């Protein structure tokens, strides 16, 4: 209802922002292609304008799904340059490599306990415990610790009293609580660890 | 050959243990990650259990070599004690399958699932004995700093267990003849306490208890939930934060 | 195009030198600025 | 056909054919519980009903491949398909309380739990070996009869058909043999390594 | 309630607490702006992925306010299971991967 | 005489096995016969047998 009198103006402002972005890129390349190529953040802006201009001038299936997020990525990059968000973004990108090891350890412990899971998975209490990657992601859903009472009723009443209804349930429940606590801790600890790097 | 046999066993244990144990447990973990894999077992089920029994025979040879080995200090390693327990369970299930006959239920019974999770323990042991090389020093240091504050977290989980048991006791005492079908026994009572502890449908508990005639159990439930929730998670978060923080204060 | 007009279209499209469509699902799409004049005909041999 | 395949895909929640797939003849797994359903086909009118009656099921022949089916004798049928044979010769075994006269065979209807295969020590399963890669295959010629177990019609249906079973299991003797020979050969090789390293 | 807030405007100890916590307004505003930017990015992405095709999933990744509220729910732990069951029937297998990536980014980072 | 197979087909009328892979394009066959561009000018119907 708004776009029927705005599509032409949307096209014009798309062209205007694309041409000012490529003019900025050319002005940055004027000082030297080596320094612009050897930079931490100018590479991202160059890739953004490169993908956008290839999708504009040449035919592309990029559609709105590429045109719009690329613009808001440029928005993020520009609003980072003004000072009072730059420190927090800087410490976020400093904190990511320390979060990488925590993520890898969590995934490895996840695999070595998902073997114990899939010993009692597959072809019974199925469709979330089978398919061997859907089982992994359902365990990830459960470790994210919200709304697993649908799962609790899914394996409910194996014998209605004890069966494996006690065993497998207490096993993956204590594994869920230990993994969730350890992961949430290790996350907040990596955060504060890299913020002590921020204020030194 | 007494101590002479022991020293021969030490040298040849180094050499042959390294070579043979590494190669055969690599192949064991290959066939065991091919085994679980609940798509390819239908492209199998006949070349799978035979190789499983073959490498279980290799593992009982490992335990035989360790039994004729140096002995008491072998039992002084907790991982080696886990090897001994895993192999006791393995020879138990192997002879249970071997004798056949029997008089109890079979054809994928609960005992079969017990043997399957025993196979999972064996697979985990294979995984842990292929990582003798290159555990990577970064995550080694991360795990070493993570395991520094063990008494604090054990005390906190002990307090969690005591508080959860007290809350389960008082709730089951207050839930008598109050449609207890969800928590009719001790296991379901502690599981429901875990669900209240883990932010899982306690609002649903409030809304289907409002359909009942008892109301004060709902303020009791929220006050218990909030005190245990805030206290425990603040305790563990703060404890582990400071636990890595003094290691941060060093090099 | 279902698997009911595959042989008929494959036979007809060579010797009429014109693409052949199936009705009951036809939709048009236009990118122009003018007056379009369309004629819709039935292929020969199926009516009088 | 469709009811049997869909029951197999709904009880065990998985299904897989043989290597050489035949459209007319599908394949059945050893691990899957076998509960056949049957149809009564009138060739003079268009109706095709479901056999809601009792029957007796037994295996009357067996072969390693096609055109290798050999007939069995009366005491052979007794040894192979009956709970009253003391020898380890049960091809299959079912848990049901209704049996025929002299308790010899099993009476089954469409409400039966199904068929679990055994093929014990005195069966073609025992001491079987593959002829090539992929699990071994067997063919069981088995009949469904209606002789003394129905009082609704005036003549019985003798459906003697053939079925394919792949994924045949191994004897405990075979597993014990391969385990013990692997242990003996590997301790021999490791002791050779130990002695020659000195 | 604003009158009650004027009541609590007293109690100089709470004033000292407010002074001790008042230097963080810029910081929490910066984190809120980061949250809003990430919310906007995944808002346009979710509308492009599930609202543009118009084969279902309306008022979850469709209308802008409903899409924003569903994304705010997904950035938290609440409502993820029912939303996941809602999205997997729209013939989009990679939607599950995108949603779990969005969870492991947004929820962990924000909290 | 060959319908004595002991395995049940989804449909009766054994000629269903005959006219199944060919009935997807019956109309085309008629187009070839009405206009006289087919075979010996013989139209073999499918519902006639």
SS3 track for A72-119: HHHHHHHHHHCHHHHHHHHHHHHHHHHHHHHHHHHHHHHHHHHHHHHC
Give the Cα separation of A164 and A171 in Å (integer): 10
Method: cryo-EM
> Which residue among E26, E37, E77 places its CB closest to the CB of A144?
E77
Burial of residue A186 (CB within 10 Å: 0-12, 13-18, 19+) is buried
Q: Please indicate whether, in this complex, the C-beta atoms of E52 and A146 are within 8 angstroms of each other.
A: no
Give the Cα separation of B36 and B116 in Å (integer): 10
Query: What values do phi and psi take at A51, rounded to 5?
Result: -65, -45
CA atoms within 13 A on the CB side of B143: 11
Q: What is the DSSP letter of E93?
A: T
Q: Are residues A28 and A41 in contact, defined by beta-carbon separation less than 8 angstroms? A: no
| Tokens matching residue D84 | 């009253």
Q: What is the DSSP letter of D99?
A: B
N-to-C CA span, chain A? 53
Distances (CA, A) of A108 to A196, B127, B139: 28, 11, 12
Q: Please indicate whether, in this complex, the C-beta atoms of D14 and A123 are within 8 angstroms of each other.
A: yes
Which residues are CB-contacts of D35 (< 8 A; sequence separation ≥ 6)? D4, D7, D11, D112, D113, D114, D115
Helices H / strands E in chain B, number of each: 10, 0
Q: Which residues, listed in sequence order, are joined to residue A69 by a DSSP beta bridge?
A: none
Q: What is the DSSP string of D100-117?
A: -GGG-SBEE-TTS--BEE
Which residues are CB-contacts of B12 (< 8 A; sequence separation ≥ 6)? D193, D194, D197, D198
Q: Are residues D144 and D157 in contact, defined by beta-carbon separation less than 8 angstroms? A: yes
Which residues are CB-contacts of D110 (< 8 A; sequence separation ≥ 6)? D37, D38, D50, D51, D52
Q: What is the chain E residue with the closest CA to A96? A: E109
Q: Please indicate whether, in this complex, the C-beta atoms of F8 and D41 are within 8 angstroms of each other.
A: yes
Please compute Rg for chain A using Cα positions: 25
E48: chain A residues, CB-CB within 8 Å? 63-65, 68-69
| Tokens matching residue B41 | 């077992």
CA atoms within 13 A on the CB side of C28: 8
Q: Please indicate whether, in this complex, the C-beta atoms of F31 and C8 are within 8 angstroms of each other.
A: yes
Report the DSSP pairing between strands D137-145 and D159-166. Answer: antiparallel
Neighbour tally for D178: CB within 10 Å: 16
From C34, C41, C48, C43, select the one nearest C10 (Cα to Cα).
Answer: C43
Which residues are CB-contacts of B84 (< 8 A; sequence separation ≥ 6)? B63, B66, B75
Q: Which residues, listed in sequence order, are joined to residue D40 by a DSSP beta bridge?
A: D49
Which residues are CB-contacts of E49 (< 8 A; sequence separation ≥ 6)? A65, E61, E92, E95, E98
Helices B110-130 and A163-196 meet at what angle, rounded to 10? 30
Give the Cα separation of A34 and B77 in Å (integer): 58
Report the DSSP pairing between strands D116-117 and D48-50. Answer: unpaired
Q: Alpha helices, DSSP H only, in chain A?
A: 7-30, 33-37, 42-57, 63-81, 86-118, 134-143, 149-154, 163-196
Give the Cα separation of D33 and D159 in Å (integer): 21
Maximum distance among all alpha carbons in chain E?
60
| Alpha carbon A66 to chain centroid, angstroms | 17
Q: Please indicate whether, in this complex, the C-beta atoms of F24 and C11 are within 8 angstroms of each other.
A: no
Helices B217-249 and B186-197 meet at what angle, rounded to 10? 60
Q: Please indicate whether, in this complex, the C-beta atoms of B198 and A177 are within 8 angstroms of each other.
A: yes
Nearest CA to CA, how far is A134 from chain D (Å)?
A: 16
CA angle B136, B140, B142 (to 5 degrees): 125
From A25, A21, A1, A4, select the one nearest A13 (Cα to Cα).
Answer: A21
Give the Cα separation of B139 and A66 in Å (integer): 37
Give the Cα separation of D139 and A125 in Å (integer): 33
Q: Are residues D116 and B107 in contact, defined by beta-carbon separation less than 8 angstroms? A: yes
Nearest CA to CA, how far is E15 from chain A (Å)?
A: 26
Give the Cα separation of C25 and C29 in Å (integer): 13
3-state secondary structure of D63: strand
Nearest CA to CA, how far is B2 from chain A (Å)?
A: 40
CA angle A35, A39, A43 (to 5 degrees): 110
Q: Are residues D117 and D34 in contact, defined by beta-carbon separation less than 8 angstroms? A: yes
Q: What is the chain A residue with the closest CA to B119? A: A119
- Sign, Cα dihedral of A120, A125, A128, A131: positive
Give the Cα separation of A73 and E91 in Å (integer): 28
Tabulate helix, strand, coil % of chain E (nearest 5): 75, 0, 25
Q: Are residues A79 and A64 in contact, defined by beta-carbon separation less than 8 angstroms? A: no
Q: Are residues A143 and A179 in contact, defined by beta-carbon separation less than 8 angstroms? A: yes
Give the Cα separation of C41 and C32 in Å (integer): 23
3-state secondary structure of B189: helix
| Tokens matching residue A138 | 């359902």
From D152, D158, D88, select the one nearest D126 (Cα to Cα).
Answer: D88
Q: Are residues E33 and A85 in contact, defined by beta-carbon separation less than 8 angstroms? A: yes
Give the Cα separation of A6 and A4 in Å (integer): 6
Burial of residue D97 (CB within 10 Å: 0-12, 13-18, 19+) is exposed
Tokens 């207890």 identify what position?
A: B180
Q: Are residues E44 and A69 in contact, defined by beta-carbon separation less than 8 angstroms? A: yes
Give the Cα separation of D78 and D57 in Å (integer): 13
Q: Are residues A55 and A67 in contact, defined by beta-carbon separation less than 8 angstroms? A: yes
């Amino acid at each position: 209802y708004l776009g029927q009198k705005h599509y032409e103006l949307f096209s014009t402002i798309d062209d205007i922002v694309l041409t000012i972005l490529i003019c900025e890129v050319l002005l940055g390349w004027l000082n030297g292609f080596w320094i612009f190529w050897k930079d931490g953040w100018n590479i991202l802006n160059f890739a953004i304008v490169f993908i956008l201009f290839m999708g504009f001038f040449i035919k592309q299936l990029d559609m709105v799904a590429i045109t719009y997020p690329l613009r808001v990525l440029r928005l993020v990059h520009v609003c980072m340059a003004v000072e009072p968000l730059a420190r927090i973004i800087k410490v976020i990108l400093q904190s990511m490599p320390d979060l990488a090891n925590v993520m890898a350890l969590i995934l490895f412990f996840m695999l070595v306990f998902s073997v114990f899971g899939v010993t009692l998975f597959g072809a019974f209490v199925p469709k979330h415990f089978q398919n061997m990657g859907v089982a992994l992601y359902t365990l990830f859903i459960c470790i994210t610790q919200d709304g697993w009472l649908d799962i609790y009723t899914d394996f409910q009443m194996d014998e209605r009293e004890y069966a494996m209804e006690v065993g497998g349930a207490i096993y993956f429940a204590v594994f869920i609580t230990l993994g969730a606590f350890i992961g949430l801790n290790l996350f907040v600890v990596v955060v504060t660890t890299n913020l002590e790097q921020m204020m030194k | 050959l007494l101590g002479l046999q022991q020293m021969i066993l030490s040298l040849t244990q180094s050499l042959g243990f390294e070579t043979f144990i590494f190669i055969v447990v690599c192949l064991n973990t290959v066939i065991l990650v091919a085994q679980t894999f609940t798509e390819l077992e239908i492209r199998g089920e006949w070349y799978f259990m035979v190789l499983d029994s073959i490498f279980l025979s290799i593992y009982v040879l490992e335990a035989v070599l360790k039994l004729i080995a140096l002995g008491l200090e072998y039992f002084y390693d907790p991982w080696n004690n886990l090897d001994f327990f895993i192999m006791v369970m393995a020879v138990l299930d192997f002879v249970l399958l071997q004798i056949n006959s029997l008089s109890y239920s079979f054809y994928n019974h609960s005992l079969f699932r017990i043997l399957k999770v025993f196979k999972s323990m064996r697979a985990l042991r294979a995984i842990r004995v292929l990582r003798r090389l290159s555990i990577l020093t970064s995550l080694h240091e991360v795990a070493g700093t993570l395991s520094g504050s063990l008494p604090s977290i054990t005390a906190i989980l002990t307090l969690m267990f005591t508080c959860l048991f007290l809350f389960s006791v008082v709730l089951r005492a207050l839930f008598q003849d109050s449609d207890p079908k969800r928590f009719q026994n001790i296991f379901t009572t502690l599981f429901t306490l875990f669900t209240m502890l883990t932010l899982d449908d306690w609002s649903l508990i409030y809304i289907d208890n409002r359909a009942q005639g008892a109301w004060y159990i709902i303020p009791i439930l929220m006050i218990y939930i909030v005190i245990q929730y805030f206290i425990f998670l603040n305790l563990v978060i703060a404890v582990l934060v400071d636990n890595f923080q003094m290691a941060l204060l060093k090099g | 195009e279902p698997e009911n007009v595959k042989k008929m279209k494959h036979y007809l499209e060579p010797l009429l030198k014109t693409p052949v469509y199936n009705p009951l699902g036809l939709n048009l799409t236009i990118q122009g600025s003018e007056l379009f004049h369309f004629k819709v005909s039935v292929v020969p041999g199926v009516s009088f | 056909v469709s009811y049997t395949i869909m029951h197999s895909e709904e009880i065990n929640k998985h299904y897989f054919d043989c290597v050489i797939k035949d459209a007319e003849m599908p394949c059945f797994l050893f691990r899957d519980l076998f509960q056949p359903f049957f149809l009564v086909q009138d060739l003079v009118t268009g109706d095709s009903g479901s056999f809601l009656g009792s029957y007796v099921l037994k295996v009357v022949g067996g072969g390693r491949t096609l055109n290798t089916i050999r007939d069995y004798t009366e005491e052979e049928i007794f040894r192979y398909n009956s709970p009253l044979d003391t020898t380890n010769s049960l091809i299959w075994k079912t848990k049901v309380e209704r049996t025929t006269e002299d308790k010899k065979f099993y009476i089954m209807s469409h409400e039966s739990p199904g068929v679990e295969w055994l093929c014990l020590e005195n069966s073609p399963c025992y001491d079987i070996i593959p002829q090539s890669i992929y699990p071994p295959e067997f063919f069981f010629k088995l009949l469904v009869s209606n002789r003394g177990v129905d009082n609704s019609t005036y003549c019985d249906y003798k459906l003697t058909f053939i079925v394919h079973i792949h994924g045949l299991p191994l004897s405990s003797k075979r597993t014990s043999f391969i385990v013990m020979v692997s242990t003996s050969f590997f301790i021999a090789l490791v002791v050779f390594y130990i002695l020659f390293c000195l | 309630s604003l009158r009650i807030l004027k009541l609590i405007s007293y109690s100089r100890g709470i004033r000292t607490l407010i002074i001790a916590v008042g230097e963080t307004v810029y910081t929490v505003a910066s984190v809120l702006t980061l949250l809003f930017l990430l919310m906007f990015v995944f808002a346009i992405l979710g509308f492009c992925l599930f609202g543009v095709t118009d084969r279902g999933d309306l008022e979850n990744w469709g209308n802008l306010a409903s899409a924003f509220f569903t994304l705010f729910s997904l950035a938290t732990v609440d409502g993820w299971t029912d939303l996941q069951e809602e999205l997997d029937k729209r013939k989009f297998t990679v939607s599950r991967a995108f949603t779990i990536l969005f969870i492991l980014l947004a929820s962990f980072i924000f909290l | 005489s060959k319908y004595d197979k002991p395995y049940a087909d989804p449909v009766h009328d054994p000629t269903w096995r005959w006219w199944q892979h060919k009935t997807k394009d019956k109309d085309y066959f008629f187009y070839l016969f009405s206009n006289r561009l087919a075979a010996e000018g013989i139209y073999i119907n499918m519902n006639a047998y």
